Design a protein around this nucleic acid. Structure first.
Ligand SMILES: [Mg+2]
Ligand SMILES: [Mg+2]
Ligand SMILES: [Mg+2]
Ligand SMILES: [Mg+2]
Ligand SMILES: [Mg+2]
Ligand SMILES: [Mg+2]
Ligand SMILES: [Mg+2]
Ligand SMILES: [Mg+2]
Ligand SMILES: [Mg+2]
Ligand SMILES: [Mg+2]
Lengths: 63, 107, 50, 31, 59, 50
RNA sequence: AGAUCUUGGUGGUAGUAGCAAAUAUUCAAACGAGAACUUUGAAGGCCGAAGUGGAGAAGGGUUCCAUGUGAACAGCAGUUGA
RNA sequence: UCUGGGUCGGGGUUUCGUACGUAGCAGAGCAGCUCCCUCGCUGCGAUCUAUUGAAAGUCAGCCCUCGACACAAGGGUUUGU
């Protein structure tokens, strides 16, 4: 369906931006039933919501 | 038969000649989609996401000159649709395009 | 036709046959092969076909 | 135990992107 | 079928092809095309350009 | 199109007994085949196909 | 019948001008009667810390937040929305 | 059709200018090994040389293929002295 709320809540719980929130494209229905920050906490631990790593900005070339 | 799969190489450079910079990559996927409707006859063409990554690998304007794809004419017998066959085109990485023929590939 | 430009006998000495698909500089295939000499495509052709 | 086919399908779920993207560490369903 | 002249590149120049350059000091050159002419006018040495006849017989 | 080289036979000209180059057009002309005959008649309104 | 008359309505123009300031979108999937525009994922880009970021004063006044509708409005659409 | 025309491939032409990799007692030199060696060996090093007139592109409105592959006697709307 629509996961505009779920991505915003996971952005706040994970303390990252909405850039770094990864919702499972396959378990969309599971996440769509998560209307509260507690459910988002459970889904983060369940692996359905993942914090993506920082995009690499290497300083090796400068070094 | 009608559930065959084949392996082509599409001269993208020929089909995107003259197109402007901000449209070469989008026109590439229209040309691959139009290619798959010709050699397979199916109005339903699905482009693999890895194939979409190959076309956009060098940005929006420096589309690769040649691409090695694989057209598979599979059955649409999963729902109700006006088409009974779709063609799923994937991406075949190659290290050379010399002497590459359109080859029938076993399933 | 009565002008001297008309009825003037045309005697061709040379006809250009260099490539018009660019700035061609050879007249015949044989002249190009002679000037350049063997290439890589000519070496590996007889490397396999003896 | 994991067999060859289980490892093959494991490769699908653990790759969630292209080259350079992180791997999927887990996927556990609980109620 | 006229005289065949030779370029900056040493290639054979046929009638109707290329240009002829007459410097004020009296020396006259001929060039096959604008690539050879520009190379000469930029004072680039023909013996350091790989596709030149002078390079291929030096090496 | 191409160009040729020919001697000139124009007395009193700067190019008499000289070689000149001239652009030429090549027009491929395979033989034509006759497959009919038309007759016309002259009328006070013009020629009409008889 | 007039008053560049007052008020209301209606034409031709005319399916016309136009919907061209600030680089840019694409693939797959889901929900759905319906997807260029919604959402998710992948990619390619932009703002480039004097930001298209994060917070306030004045002003607005409920626009805030959930759920639902798809009439009208958002000068295309919309399953989206101040 | 004595097939057809496509799509790839090949050849030709042509444009630029000699690819990656490997090799070199080539290289301004520098840093480490000196029972070592009697002039050497281990790394860094732009650049040079050979492989290599090589690499790459070339109809999309270039030329010739008869090599590969599939496809093509099909669709729709009309028309009568
Ligand atoms: Mg020309
Ligand atoms: Mg009145
Ligand atoms: Mg009156
Ligand atoms: Mg208009
Ligand atoms: Mg407009
Ligand atoms: Mg930028
Ligand atoms: Mg702000
Ligand atoms: Mg709101
Ligand atoms: Mg609207
Ligand atoms: Mg070719």
């Amino acid at each position: 369906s629509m996961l505009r709320l779920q991505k915003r809540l996971a952005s706040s719980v994970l303390r990252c931006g909405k850039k770094k929130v990864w919702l499972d494209p396959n378990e969309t229905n599971e996440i769509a039933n998560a209307n509260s920050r507690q459910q988002i906490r459970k889904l983060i631990k369940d692996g359905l919501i993942i914090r993506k790593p920082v995009t690499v900005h290497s300083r090796a070339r400068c070094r | 038969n009608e559930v065959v799969t084949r392996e082509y190489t599409i001269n993208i450079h020929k089909r995107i000649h003259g197109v402007g910079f901000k449209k070469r990559a989008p026109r590439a996927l229209k040309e691959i989609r139009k290619f798959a409707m010709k050699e397979m006859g199916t109005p339903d063409v699905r482009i693999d996401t890895r194939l979409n990554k190959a076309v956009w690998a060098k940005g929006i304007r420096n589309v690769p000159y040649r691409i090695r794809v694989r057209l598979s004419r599979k059955r649409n017998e999963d729902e109700d649709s006006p088409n009974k066959l779709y063609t799923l085109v994937t991406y075949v990485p190659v290290t050379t395009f010399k002497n590459l023929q359109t080859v029938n590939v076993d399933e | 036709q009565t002008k001297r430009r008309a009825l003037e006998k045309i005697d061709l000495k040379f006809i250009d046959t260099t490539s018009k698909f660019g700035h061609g500089r050879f007249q015949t295939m044989e002249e190009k092969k002679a000037f350049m000499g063997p290439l890589k495509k000519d070496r590996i052709a007889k490397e396999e076909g003896a | 135990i994991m067999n060859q086919e289980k490892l093959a399908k494991l490769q699908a779920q653990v790759r969630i992107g292209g080259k350079g993207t992180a791997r999927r560490k887990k996927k556990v369903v609980h109620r | 079928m006229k005289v065949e002249l030779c370029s900056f590149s040493g290639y054979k120049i046929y009638p109707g092809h290329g240009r002829r350059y007459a410097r004020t000091d009296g020396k006259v050159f001929q060039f096959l095309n604008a690539k050879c002419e520009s190379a000469f006018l930029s004072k680039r040495n023909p013996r350091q350009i790989n596709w030149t006849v002078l390079y291929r017989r030096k090496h | 199109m191409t160009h040729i080289v020919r001697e000139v036979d124009r007395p009193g000209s700067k190019v008499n007994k000289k070689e000149v180059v001239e652009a030429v057009t090549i027009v491929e002309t395979p033989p034509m085949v006759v497959v009919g005959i038309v007759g016309y008649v002259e009328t006070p309104r013009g020629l009409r196909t008889f």
